């Protein structure tokens, strides 16, 4: 073959097809995992300032990050983590959370290593492990049993201590923790994080912790960073995303925070891949964090206002989707909620599709074509052997304009009353 | 061990030391490979327009490129290459030329593959080959005969056919071509490209061609793209950089052009690493290319005016550097020229440095600290076994403001009085 063997089995991109099918129908697109409204004015203004300020901002900045950005990341997150963070040794600016994840896998995961992944998982964790020669090892959150009185909560999806412990071996290099979780919206508790911490310390494993949804927490639930737990800083890489923080997904700026003895290897990958991140977006992100640090916990702060606003959008969507028999699982965080479609699988078992195509994928195509609503089938966030079991959930994104939620309700009205 | 074996031998970054030392002294920085004056107005205005326009430009764009950008790249470079280019199948937008190179190496280079690299080489080609499991194989340009008191020319650094042919084996996967070359400023001739093309076809080898300095050509020399030669489109990946095209290195936008059967593998790497490139800089680059396509070959176009202006800066620097006994090699393209320091090595051999330290590295440190001028030791663009033999050149960048060149002359006049 022409191509490298590291690419085996990772060429299929579900997202390219998802975008394709939605674009051919008249839809309310609740599949897109980004806002369809503007970022806050201070963020847009920050980028405007960066592209109209010191003309030298048009030229290269420092390899490991624009210094004013690494300074504020170290200060702001050092406070939150209860850790002294050196900007030069403990911070790397990357091309989004995606680039940060990729850099961590390529630095640490080697042929034969195992990587523990928690289902449902942000889908790239599996192919990134594979491309680095690692063997993914899956542990499944166990859905809470639902009574048809009250809706389930993401919090009730359990990480079984015995099942998790049994996944660790001498070959475990890393465990990937995503909290708040996409697609499920689970916000991991202190007790759950202490379990993960205990096993990572026992087995000398690195925890790669994807915290992009840090600020998107609801119902009084608190984001806890595993790197803040005793002894965890020295074995944790913590990842963030400016796009998910400031509702500006197209900025594609992210970072990794961690101890020098691990970070040095990520710096090695960085300097031998992209070398620099763009200068001006970094300046915009630095200015945006400065604004939020100055207004920390205050009523006008984005980190106070925005999750409150999005909690209302969540509640609106939860009520609306029930009108057609979808069963939401209330998320404690993230942009997302999932709905159980088991009643549809029961009443409408035979949908067109390919052999061994999970029901949810077939259902989403049906719903797009017939009802004009887009969701993402949750089976894409499962290992292939588990897709036959976890085939009855779909993911919706509620971080949407009020007009979009109105349009959703119009589709639901038609679904209920027409034909 | 903690880190992946793919990182072996690639952790050392010479650029961090160079940048650090220069920041610690009063200097005219001719080591920085980027302009110290603004990008052209139309380019800065394009970015301003992108960050103040359609608010949805703040959110994710398409994975393989912002469609207006891939459209104009395909149209414009299609015309330049004499090639029908499909924007969806033949174009990938990347995080600069660096990201483009990285994507190519990770898609195609596998364990045990040989990659032919031409010395002097842009330094990342070697470690990128190594991280992909490849074995770098070096062919060395031969500096031309030092003639009748005249300065050397980059054109006369020869690519010996018998040497090059001897480097091709059944294990050769790719050859990396950089034209115009950094650091040398050589613009490869049609004959030289035909030599490379003939061997790539004979041995069924892919040519990765780094053409970031495409527009920076002088003295009537023409940039020829190897992908435009008969039979080469099907085996060539052509790389460019928006930063080097529009004098905006901090934008970090690049691209790869090539046939689908190769590009599909680069897309696999892309979707499993960064996933998206930032939206708004892509919009700026698209607008900038649209401007230049409309004015193509006209006197008011940047691609005509800018290299003409920079040729004047080149000529100024060539004259000035000779005043202290540095011997420039006249470049036909790129931002750079190199000067022979052999007369200094001979008359001043005993500069402080480590036991094995190439003379040029020692000379640059002495020049920074004592003469107030920064250059880059050319030995960093050689394989380690060859560094002791090519230790007598340093690289200057002439793409500088009038004021900077005046400042250079002030340093040089002070040096001359103390030769
Ligand atoms: Na262990
Ligand atoms: Na061959």
mmCIF file with all atom_site columns, C-alpha atoms and ligand atoms in Angstrom, chain B residues 169-172 202-205, ligand 2:
data_model
loop_
_atom_site.group_PDB
_atom_site.id
_atom_site.type_symbol
_atom_site.label_atom_id
_atom_site.label_alt_id
_atom_site.label_comp_id
_atom_site.label_asym_id
_atom_site.label_entity_id
_atom_site.label_seq_id
_atom_site.pdbx_PDB_ins_code
_atom_site.Cartn_x
_atom_site.Cartn_y
_atom_site.Cartn_z
_atom_site.occupancy
_atom_site.B_iso_or_equiv
_atom_site.pdbx_formal_charge
_atom_site.auth_seq_id
_atom_site.auth_comp_id
_atom_site.auth_asym_id
_atom_site.auth_atom_id
_atom_site.pdbx_PDB_model_num
ATOM   1 C  CA  . UNK B 1 169 ? 15.884 2.206  -3.654  1.00 0.00 ? 169 UNK B CA  1
ATOM   2 C  CA  . UNK B 1 170 ? 12.941 -0.203 -3.461  1.00 0.00 ? 170 UNK B CA  1
ATOM   3 C  CA  . UNK B 1 171 ? 12.324 1.217  0.046   1.00 0.00 ? 171 UNK B CA  1
ATOM   4 C  CA  . UNK B 1 172 ? 11.917 4.849  -1.093  1.00 0.00 ? 172 UNK B CA  1
ATOM   5 C  CA  . UNK B 1 202 ? 10.896 5.207  -12.493 1.00 0.00 ? 202 UNK B CA  1
ATOM   6 C  CA  . UNK B 1 203 ? 10.765 4.128  -8.846  1.00 0.00 ? 203 UNK B CA  1
ATOM   7 C  CA  . UNK B 1 204 ? 7.077  4.899  -8.197  1.00 0.00 ? 204 UNK B CA  1
ATOM   8 C  CA  . UNK B 1 205 ? 7.837  7.464  -5.474  1.00 0.00 ? 205 UNK B CA  1
HETATM 9 NA NA1 . LIG C 2 .   ? 9.620  1.531  -5.747  1.00 0.00 ? 2   LIG C NA1 1
#
